[PDB]
Amino acid sequence: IIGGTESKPHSRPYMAYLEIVTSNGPSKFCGGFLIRRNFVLTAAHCAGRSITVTLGAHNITEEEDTWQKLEVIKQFRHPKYNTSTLHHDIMLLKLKEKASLTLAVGTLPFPSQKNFVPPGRMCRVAGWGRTGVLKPGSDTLQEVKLRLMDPQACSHFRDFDHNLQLCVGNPRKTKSAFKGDSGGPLLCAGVAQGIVSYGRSDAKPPAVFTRISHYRPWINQILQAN
Numbered sequence: 527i528i529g530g531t532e533s534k535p536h537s538r539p540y541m542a543y544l545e546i547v548t549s550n551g552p553s554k555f556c557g558g559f560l561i562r563r564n565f566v567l568t569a570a571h572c573a574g575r576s577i578t579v580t581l582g583a584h585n586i587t588e589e590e591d592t593w594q595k596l597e598v599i600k601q602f603r604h605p606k607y608n609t610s611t612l613h614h615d616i617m618l619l620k621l622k623e624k625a626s627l628t629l630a631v632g633t634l635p636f637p638s639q640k641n642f643v644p645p646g647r648m649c650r651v652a653g654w655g656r657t658g659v660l661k662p663g664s665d666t667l668q669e670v671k672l673r674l675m676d677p678q679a680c681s682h683f684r685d686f687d688h689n690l691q692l693c694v695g696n697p698r699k700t701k702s703a704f705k706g707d708s709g710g711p712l713l714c715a716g717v718a719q720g721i722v723s724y725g726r727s728d729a730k731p732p733a734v735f736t737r738i739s740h741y742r743p744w745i746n747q748i749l750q751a752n
């Protein structure tokens with residue numbers, strides 16, 4: 527998160543910190559969010575050979591009783607995820623066991639309604655990602671308030687599509703999701719409407735988020751079958 531504030535500790539109890547293993551490089555990291563006691567939503571580009579989820583974290587360098595470190599038993603990457611266009615950048619992770627509900631850990635289920643969210647309003651995103659181009663991932667959970675933009679603001683992303691994705695962050699400010707915030711929720715009036723996907727390497731906003739409303743049928747189909 528660039529240009530944000532430190533979250534109040536444990537104030538976003540659905541937030542998940544993902545450690546991503548690959549066979550041919552060191553660990554990588556993403557965010558995500560708990561939508562059922564045994565399911566985390568994140569970005570498809572966060573897939574790996576194996577993943578471990580930490581729930582209940584604030585400072586990810588300091589072990590505490592709120593932590594739950596949980597094994598992922600299976601990854602459900604969207605079957606149409608495209609590494610060229612980056613369309614359909616969404617994935618569900620099934621946890622080996624259901625998480626414990628505490629003050630610091632809880633779900634964020636979708637409401638019944640799945641209305642298309644138009645441009646104009648302010649929403650908020652949280653993550654442990656980099657705080658600038660030359661800066662390392664934050665030890666503490668950070669968050670920032672960003673403007674939903676008209677889709678023409680994201681035209682320069684030549685594979686951007688308004689039906690599939692949200693355009694997020696006023697270009698006149700530095701405030702943005704960035705590298706390492708991958709997979710985190712964009713909440714608009716307390717409802718998850720987006721998932722951090724991608725942006726510019728130089729961190730100039732806006733960035734591109736997956737539009738959750740488009741994928742609600744797919745999300746439901748995985749949950750009901752598993």
Ligand SMILES: Cc1cccc2cccc(Cn3c(C(=O)O)cc4ccccc43)c12
Binds near residue numbers: 722
């Ligand atoms: C999340 C994010 C936000 C803003 C700007 C970004 C600029 C570049 C990449 C990312 C995230 N990202 C990464 C990575 O290296 O972090 C690899 C990758 C592959 C497919 C899709 C997204 C991807 C950005």
Ligand SMILES: [Zn+2]
Binds near residue numbers: 535536592
């Ligand atoms: Zn604590």
